[PDB]
Design a protein around this nucleic acid. Sequence first.
RNA 1: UUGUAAUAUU
Length: 341
Amino acid sequence: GRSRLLEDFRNNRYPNLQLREIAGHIMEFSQDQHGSRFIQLKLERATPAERQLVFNEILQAAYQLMVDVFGNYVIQKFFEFGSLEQKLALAERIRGHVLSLALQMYGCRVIQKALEFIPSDQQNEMVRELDGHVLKCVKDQNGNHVVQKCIECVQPQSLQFIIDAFKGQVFALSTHPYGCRVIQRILEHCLPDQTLPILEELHQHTEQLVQDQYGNYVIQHVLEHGRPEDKSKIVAEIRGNVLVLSQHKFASNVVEKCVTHASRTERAVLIDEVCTMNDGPHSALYTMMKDQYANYVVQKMIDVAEPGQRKIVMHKIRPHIATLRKYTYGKHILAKLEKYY
RNA sequence: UUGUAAUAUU
């Protein structure tokens, strides 16, 4: 199958092998496991002139190498360290294949690499081909990364269609394993008038989103990085739901995050809520102190409360210390209290 | 010795 030259190379019959010596075998070498690594390493220390000799052969069947397990690496090397003309010639080779490459395990890596190192006008050409196929890519294990790289590297103006695709889909994709990460890149990069519709749908579903295994991360992203107004809407939804949401595997992390990033006044109001709520027989606090998730929340409130409110809370916990030692998760409240005592 | 993130390529 291979060439004597490639078989001989695989069987270490060439310790002094140079790129010059494999002219005419570049394609075949690029598709070989060792051949590819050989080319990748020699190219790192090749003069611009030597790199061009290689490029001449990789150009014609560029597509064939882009979708190849090993050949994709040789292509990306050229986006990383190539002349402008080489990078344009490769972007010209990608033209009309963006989507099919994006949805492919190796091809997608070439695309991501290209977005990072081609000129803005060329990025804009490349991304146009994703228009109509956003959801397909976002849901895709490989494609979703191409989309994230678009958001990171491309002028936000060129991506209105991403936003437009997400309209009515925010909830669906904030609860999707790959869509949630895409939402998190949008909140980070896309313009205010572009996040605006995204934030609107998030606020409409926050109670539900905090209880999702992925959604909860979206809501916490806003609590950590968003505008004060956004943070406020979120804490307000959480507030009045602290007791139940504190006992929920997923949303319990969101109540902690609200406790950390809420205004001093908001934080105090949330801590006050659990202090004054009475879940039947005993306090909502008591319920939380023996719960598997909420014990964390209570400890969090202890660490972030202003000293005066922390004291009140501690003193309110005191009456139940003897009981708390019997329940599995109680030890953890007591550990925390002991730090402060 | 208490609780959640994407099996993304040589």
